[PDB]
Amino acid sequence: LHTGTKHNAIISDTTTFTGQSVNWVLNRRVKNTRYTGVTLKGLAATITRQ
Amino acid sequence: MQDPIIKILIGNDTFLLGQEIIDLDFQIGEGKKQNNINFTIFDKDGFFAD
């Protein structure tokens, strides 16, 4: 997933693109929540479905 | 001997090897390391940069 770009305008025409894995999507926003009575697979499933 | 082919699809355009691609990086991480890409293209007049 594209996340950043760089470009040198003066003479040298160079544009640098940067992309990251989808885990970057899971690390974007800080959350406050609570989980009770859920297995690791269930918690991961809910988080991925989000 | 190396006979590379590199094709990058971004947005709605493609960069092929020998057309504008200057350099390309990689990462395939497991734990602390994620997967990322950093690739540089020749952007005459910065059009793609725009």
Binding site: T3, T18, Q20, S21, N23, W24, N27 | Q27, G29, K32, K33, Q34, N36, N38
Partner: peptide, 24 residues
């Protein structure tokens, strides 16, 4: 000398930005 000091600084910066995107 200063040219290369700057080059080295920029190398380090891009290696640190690399590390930012290298780690999850």
């Amino acid at each position: 000398p200063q040219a290369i000091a700057k080059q080295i600084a920029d190398i380090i910066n891009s290696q640190w930005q690399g590390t930012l995107t290298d780690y999850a």
